[PDB]
Amino acid sequence: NLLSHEQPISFVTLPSFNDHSFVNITVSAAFGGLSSANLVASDTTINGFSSFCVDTRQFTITLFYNVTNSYGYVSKSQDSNCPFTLQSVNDYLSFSKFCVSTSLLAGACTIDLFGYPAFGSGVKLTSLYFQFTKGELITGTPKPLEGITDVSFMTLDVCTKYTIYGFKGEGIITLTNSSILAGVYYTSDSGQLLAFKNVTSGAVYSVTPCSFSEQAAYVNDDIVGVISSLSNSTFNNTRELPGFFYHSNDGSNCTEPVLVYSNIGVCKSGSIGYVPSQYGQVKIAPTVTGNISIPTNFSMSIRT
């Protein structure tokens, strides 16, 4: 599939309006010294306080650095003891609660923020402690995203990079008229999303991967045809068979298969056909009084 730079984003979540608050974090530090660069008077705030906890159903984390290095610039980096990074929290993650503080919260992960004011050993500017719970209601976001009855967006029938009730992947979303009466999402034993509801309307949508697996018939150093779930492919002829499609450059039938499996035969030209059962030589039942036949001129054969 040839959508690498093109592919639409999709986001589906439990029905919401535009209910947004920024968690904006200010990190401040001062530096001095003439024989080396070193740190003084660091402070951290989230929305002007030492701690914050999210209540609105969307949020954006933004970092403001307000570093006053006399040597002209500072490079900045992050360490995560955490299943996210500050810019990745914005990339449609979902939570049941989310609180951030400059001081250690009960279950918390750490993001530690570092500056390098003169290159070599860095210095810790600030530590952010995040307490969160994997869930469905509160979702991270890049910018306040508009809507009245729902905030969700989809593109159907096109390979999309999706977040759907916290599952992520690339896939095709299609509407199905296979209505289901309980829950919000349906998963395989593979842990992979198969379908989900637009719970405001009861409609159920199904998710496929956007590259399917195929068997390529390779003969004489080229792919002469391909066996597939798909109706369309690069070869200029397609044939339909009871379990699958066969794509090739030659729609004829096959009388000289160079590959067989079961009763499916693929010819050198890339034709497909059905190959008949081998016929064994006749053996004669012992019989008493009929018109019988007795084996006469015998050749010799070596079976290896």
């Binding site: 995560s80 299943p83 996210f84 990074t85 990745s88 990339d91 990079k161 599952f167 992520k168 992947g169 979303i173 299609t174 199905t176 008229n177 296979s178 289901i180 395989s188 034993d189 593979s190 842990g191 992979q192 198969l194 379908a195 159920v204 949508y205 199904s206 496929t208 991967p209 956007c210 590259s211 399917f212 697996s213 068997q215 597939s228 779930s229 798909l230 109706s231 009871p242 379990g243 699958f244 067989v260 499996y261 079961s262 009763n263 059962s277 081998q278 016929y279 064994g280 030589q281 006749v282 053996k283 004669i284 039942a285 012992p286 019989t287 008493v288 009929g290 018109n291 019988i292 036949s293």
Partner: protein
């Protein structure tokens, strides 16, 4: 007896299984040199070997198959109606319906249904999105039926000028002659044989539709139809086992922060995301190596059944066995029919069991004039008199030891 001929082959696209089509994960997977080659070619080169073995032992004969399939088979007293069929037989339809109704994967599923999401994907497409394909069964139930009829009709093929089917009371008389040369032929014993077989095939066809409220422990042993139905259902249920355990190992997380690769690459930094995706790659390659080891031993378990099935077709069905118990345990063998069964053949070894024994004085030989000692030439024949209470007697007979077929001695036997 049920003998499995084949195992339903399975194939994997290792990049789809390990990486869910994520490009950055495929780029890491190529660093595990030949891990994919050594999984894929082990499944493909084994699925090919099954295809050439099973399609090469299922040699049909066209001039034998035309004597069974048309139901123009001259049973001449024997009721072959349950065995032949016009498409499958009565026993073949009961045997599939007793097991393939609760079964799966013995009817070939279509992948055309699963590029389009207009219906919510079921188990056999949730596997296909996980990159694992069950191939069409190595031979279809129509080729497997034609083979079975080509063996039943092969018994009526007395000669290649095949204008009508040979009356089966003649093919059974020739099969009795290899046990003992039949002599008292103007007796009811050919009808005793026929009406006994008519009752015996009536009683196998009833067991393919009866229930365990009518089973007793001797009817559950090593060569009877309830043991064959336990063995058929063990095959049909077992075929999912390795393929389910392959698929659930995709929801293990192998110490990574999540069980999905686009989740990890969309939440960690790209340096640390590669480090956690290596534990999913290593774990999922191990889950495939464990599945290839299960799958290759499940082909090897079948191949010793196939080799035995081919021996029973050549020694019990196409010819007749002098080996005492090979075709259906204790008794004198005369023929085995074959029928198609879910992933193999069902053999109906028709063995002669004696209701009665005669007791006779056996005589080693004749010491004529105290001078010339006559002995029978053949160790299969016994020289006897009916008069047990004396060393010499009214009149003498020769018969086989295997069946009581008396005749007067001839100067050519001694």
């Amino acid at each position: 007896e049920y003998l499995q001929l084949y195992n339903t082959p399975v194939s994997v696209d290792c990049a789809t299984y390990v990486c869910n089509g994520n490009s950055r994960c495929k780029q890491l997977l190529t660093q595990y040199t030949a891990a994919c080659k050594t999984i894929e070619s082990a499944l493909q080169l084994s699925a090919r070997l099954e295809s050439v073995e099973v399609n090469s032992m299922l040699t049909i004969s066209e001039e034998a198959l035309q004597l069974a399939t048309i139901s123009s088979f001259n049973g001449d007293g024997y009721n072959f109606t349950n065995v032949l069929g016009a498409k499958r037989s009565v026993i073949e339809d009961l045997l599939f319906n007793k097991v393939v109704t609760n079964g799966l994967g013995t009817v070939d599923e279509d992948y055309k249904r699963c590029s389009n999401g207009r219906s919510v994907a079921d188990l056999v497409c949730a596997q296909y999105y996980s990159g694992v394909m069950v191939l069409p069964g190595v031979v279809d139930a129509e080729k497997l039926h034609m083979y079975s009829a080509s063996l039943i009709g092969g018994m009526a093929l007395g000669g290649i000028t095949a204008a009508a089917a040979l009356p089966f009371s003649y093919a059974v008389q020739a099969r009795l002659n290899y046990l003992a040369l039949q002599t008292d032929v103007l007796q009811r014993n050919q009808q005793l044989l026929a009406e006994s077989f008519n009752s015996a095939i009536g009683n196998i066809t009833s067991a393919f539709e009866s229930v365990k409220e009518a089973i007793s422990q001797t009817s559950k042993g090593l060569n009877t139809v309830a043991h064959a139905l336990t063995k058929v259902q063990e095959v049909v249920n077992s075929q999912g086992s390795a393929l389910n355990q392959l698929t659930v190992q995709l929801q293990h997380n192998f110490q990574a922060i999540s069980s999905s690769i686009d989740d990890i690459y969309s939440r960690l930094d790209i340096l640390s995301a590669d480090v956690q995706v290596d534990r999913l790659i290593t774990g999922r390659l191990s889950a495939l190596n464990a599945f290839v080891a299960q799958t290759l031993t499940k082909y090897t378990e079948v191949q010793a059944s196939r080799k035995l099935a081919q021996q029973k077709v050549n020694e019990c069905v196409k010819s007749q066995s002098q080996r005492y118990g090979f075709c259906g345990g204790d008794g004198e063998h005369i023929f085995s029919l074959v029928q198609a069964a879910p992933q193999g053949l069902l053999f109906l070894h028709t063995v002669l069991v004696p209701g009665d024994f005669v007791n006779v004085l056996a005589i080693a030989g004749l010491c004529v004039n105290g001078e010339i000692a006559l002995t029978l030439r053949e160790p299969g024949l016994v020289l006897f008199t009916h008069e047990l209470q004396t060393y010499t007697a009214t009149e003498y007979f020769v018969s086989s030891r295997r069946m009581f077929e008396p005749r007067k001695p001839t100067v050519s036997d001694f």
